[PDB]
């Protein structure tokens, strides 16, 4: 819900910048001279930035030394069919690259195997000026590096086709990270329109970083492989560590926990990592079922939670959810719902970007009169 709080960046802003340097006179000639005898080199551009340059394909050599010499000029007839096949192979990759660029207007993400093969990407990772821990982390999870990379078309001139590959840099690794799932808490009264609710809006990923917490509201952007979470710091907010206190005490005096308020009580399920939260309201029938014993639990009105140890599916109304069967340990902390604390008569509804202190101020401003 807090994705509107994020700032606006430019992902390719760096890469395009290098692309621009590539249009300056002499730069293509410099890169060409550097790769004259080698397929990998380090080149310092006019602005002084040092970049790794690689020659992945050499069509010039094949075309000018293995195709033209073997064809006659009087009644041309190629001696061998295999040559044709070889040409079709060698050109194929180039064609594919062009196709992708034409589809993506010169900026393609994720980077495909035509732009940068697995071996070339691994070699680039090995040659990057980073620590060995980062090299090991990204040498693995190569698919995530591909999904977080960009490919920018830069220039085609002086018989050289150059494009720019923009790879991620993970400066923060192995720090503790956790995920917060929130569902709605409504007072399960009988009358349809007499119910007031609250939901916490701070759902998403949190990660320790340099003494603060990086908060990613769109948990869909973050990619989870095993217990590793790859997240883009661009779509994040820097918060004090005290935000974690909101998990153990929503009314703690150190941090003001963000919440929303409403009068609509609909039943829904949030499938968490090790279980499922079920908010059952109204006449909706909510159950938890196992593939062997069938229905094993029936939820009453309110908010409940079931782990995935014995539960395989959860049915809320006409919806059926499959729970994640990832191994782990779940704990249930019993407590009085905080929704019951509020007086429905003076409860402020239809508040989206609010918090517990802001809701208290709103209630106290309704008791300004009277």
């Amino acid at each position, epitope marked *: 819900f807090l994705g509107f709080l994020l700032g606006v960046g430019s992902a390719i802003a760096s890469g395009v910048a290098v692309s621009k340097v590539l249009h300056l006179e002499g730069e293509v000639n410099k890169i060409k001279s550097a790769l004259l005898s080698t397929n990998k080199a380090v080149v310092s551009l006019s602005n002084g930035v040092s970049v790794l340059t690689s020659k992945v394909l050499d069509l010039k050599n094949y075309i000018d030394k293995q195709l033209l010499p073997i064809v006659n000029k009087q009644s041309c007839s190629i001696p061998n069919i295999e040559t044709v096949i070889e040409f079709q192979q060698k050109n194929n990759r180039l064609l594919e690259i062009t196709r992708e660029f034409s589809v993506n207007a010169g900026v393609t993400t994720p980077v495909s195997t035509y732009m940068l093969t697995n071996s070339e990407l691994l070699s680039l990772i090995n040659d990057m000026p980073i620590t060995n821990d980062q090299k090991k982390l990204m040498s693995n999870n190569v698919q995530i590096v591909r999904q977080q990379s960009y490919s920018i078309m830069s220039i085609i001139k002086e018989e050289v086709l150059a494009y720019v590959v923009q790879l991620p840099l993970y400066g923060v690794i192995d720090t503790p990270c956790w995920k917060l799932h929130t569902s709605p808490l409504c007072t399960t009264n009988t009358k349809e329109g007499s119910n007031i609710c609250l939901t916490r809006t701070d759902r998403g990923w949190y990660c320790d970083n340099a003494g603060s917490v990086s908060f990613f509201p769109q948990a869909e952007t973050c990619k989870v492989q095993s217990n590793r979470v790859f997240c883009d710091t661009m779509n994040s907010l820097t918060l004090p560590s005290e935000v974690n206190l909101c998990n153990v*005490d929503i009314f703690n005096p150190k941090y003001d926990c963000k919440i929303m308020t409403s009068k609509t009580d609909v039943s829904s399920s949030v499938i968490t990592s090790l279980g499922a939260i079920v908010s059952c309201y109204g006449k909706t029938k909510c159950t938890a079922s196992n593939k062997n014993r069938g229905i094993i639990k029936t939820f009453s009105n309110g908010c409940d939670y079931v782990s995935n140890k014995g539960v395989d599916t959860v049915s809320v109304g006409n919806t059926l959810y499959y729970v994640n069967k990832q191994e782990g340990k779940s704990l249930y902390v019993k407590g*009085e719902p*905080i929704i019951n*604390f*509020y*007086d429905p*008569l*003076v409860f402020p509804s239809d508040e989206f970007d609010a918090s517990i202190s802001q809701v208290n101020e709103k209630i106290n401003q309704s008791l300004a009169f*009277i």
Partner: antibody
Amino acid sequence: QVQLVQSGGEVKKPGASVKVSCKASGYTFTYYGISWVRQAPGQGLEWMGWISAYNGNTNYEQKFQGRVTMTTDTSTGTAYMELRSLTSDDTAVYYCARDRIVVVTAANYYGLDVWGQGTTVTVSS
Amino acid sequence: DIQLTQSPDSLAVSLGERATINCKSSQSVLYRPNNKNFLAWYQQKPGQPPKLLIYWASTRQSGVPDRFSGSGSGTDFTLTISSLQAEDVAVYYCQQYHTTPLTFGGGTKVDIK
């Protein structure tokens, strides 16, 4: 289970001071206040004071002003009530009761819904 | 302060018969922001702390038997027992939490004839 457990009874001499403990269980201690009620033998309940477990705010009875001190220990979740200059009129049973919710403004007030078992204090020679 | 008075001081009711206790306050106990009468009825037995029976104007605490009921408003309130039983022999108090200090009632003792 929401409950309050108080310390055992005490025997004191006049002019001394008495400390009564009240530990809370089954609920978040810092979300509610604690009231202290005194009951003399063969007499009705007498309210002595109320201490907020959230920020330590205290409200004492006018008769007990300057004579009774209430403290809150959030680490152990225990309310302590101390009384000084005991006389032959202090001998009574003291109860700790859970009071209004202090973390939400104008929250639902159902009164003193949870009570302690009671501590008897006898002041005699 | 708001002083509370109870009537009668002592009550004697036969088994299975209605019992009535009246509580009157020197000042109104209505909480204007939520329109609630901040009065509570407790019962106490020998060797036991008071237990909350009625809160607000007329609301029953969870687990309280349905025979106990509250009524009244403004200045006079009433606690009613539909059918007095053996276990209902206790001292009943009315107290107001509208404003500090919390003044409890004088106390009414219920006995079986």
